[PDB]
Amino acid sequence: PVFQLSTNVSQSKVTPELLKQISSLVARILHKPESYVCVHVVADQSMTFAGTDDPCAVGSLKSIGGVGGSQNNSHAKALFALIKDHLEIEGNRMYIEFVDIGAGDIAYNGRTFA
Amino acid sequence: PVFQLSTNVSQSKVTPELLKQISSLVARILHKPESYVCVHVVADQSMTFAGTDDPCAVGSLKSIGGVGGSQNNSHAKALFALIKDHLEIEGNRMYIEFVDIGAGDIAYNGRTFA
Amino acid sequence: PVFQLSTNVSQSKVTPELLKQISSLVARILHKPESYVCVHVVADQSMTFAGTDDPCAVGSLKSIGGVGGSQNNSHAKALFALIKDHLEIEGNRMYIEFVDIGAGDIAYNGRTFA
Numbered sequence: 001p002v003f004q005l006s007t008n009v010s011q012s013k014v015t016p017e018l019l020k021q022i023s024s025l026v027a028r029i030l031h032k033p034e035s036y037v038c039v040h041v042v043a044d045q046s047m048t049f050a051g052t053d054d055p056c057a058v059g060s061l062k063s064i065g066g067v068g069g070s071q072n073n074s075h076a077k078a079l080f081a082l083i084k085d086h087l088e089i090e091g092n093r094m095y096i097e098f099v100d101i102g103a104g105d106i107a108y109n110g111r112t113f114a
Numbered sequence: 115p116v117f118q119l120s121t122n123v124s125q126s127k128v129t130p131e132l133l134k135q136i137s138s139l140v141a142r143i144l145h146k147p148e149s150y151v152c153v154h155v156v157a158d159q160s161m162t163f164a165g166t167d168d169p170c171a172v173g174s175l176k177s178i179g180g181v182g183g184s185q186n187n188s189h190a191k192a193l194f195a196l197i198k199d200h201l202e203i204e205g206n207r208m209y210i211e212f213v214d215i216g217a218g219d220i221a222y223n224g225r226t227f228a
Numbered sequence: 229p230v231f232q233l234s235t236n237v238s239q240s241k242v243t244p245e246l247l248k249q250i251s252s253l254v255a256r257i258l259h260k261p262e263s264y265v266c267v268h269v270v271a272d273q274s275m276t277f278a279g280t281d282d283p284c285a286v287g288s289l290k291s292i293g294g295v296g297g298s299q300n301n302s303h304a305k306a307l308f309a310l311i312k313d314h315l316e317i318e319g320n321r322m323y324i325e326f327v328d329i330g331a332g333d334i335a336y337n338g339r340t341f342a
Binding site: 006045046047048049050051053056058067068069070072073075076077079080081091092094095096097098099100 | 116118125128130133134136137138148149150151152153154155156157176215218219220221222223224225226
């Protein structure tokens, strides 16, 4: 399970503790061990949303399962909640994409999972 | 609708006006309100194309619909045209990926669209 | 064929020769001309794996075909091998995603391939 986020806010707000809290939350919402969670947050990007350069973000959560349907709604609410409290990005200027990956299409330690 | 572009050219060329013109163009070619368009351009990356570090770019346009078939051809011509005039990237060293997203697989303001 | 890699290791290790060796290897493992290969490596990112900020990486290989099934296993072994020798990332802290792209969904030089 991989969570990636791009934002135009300052790298000052992207603390190593934020990455930890994201990691923990992703493990919880996907019901997978945190030992497999990878988090990547990218700051101070050149980004617009709705034509303006005000604070915004685009992210994605990629997983083998756990990313289909109304579960994505509940999971979104939590991720949006965490990202705003820490990065102060309004919900109406952020997207998070949910991407289901096949076991044969992701390699860990040199081999696919299936 | 999200447009993302990575390039090895200097951040000097990535002006806030470029991002605006991209935003406008993406809204037009997808026939969606610009209020939902997010643009992300990343510059001065470590990239090769055809084995060389000359100017190049890889991008993607992700959307709920509007990204299938020969429409992608017309849309490509316009995006390639804009990116070259501003970033001076030859067409034969750029890729743009078109990615259809399901409504249940992208969250905005804390909830999916379906 | 596009190979992208994000890592928290220093940009010092991402030499222009590394990008060349990656390019060469991607051409070989996908059996496609290196003239179409694009490589993008991003360094010194804010990333955690398993909750820690030790060296880690996430990448993806996107291609029209050549990315399905047990072939992904053999290809992974080679990519993991190259990335570690040069970037010193342990296999158990790296993911590589394999993504099949439709010919109508990627544009080169202003037009899709189909």
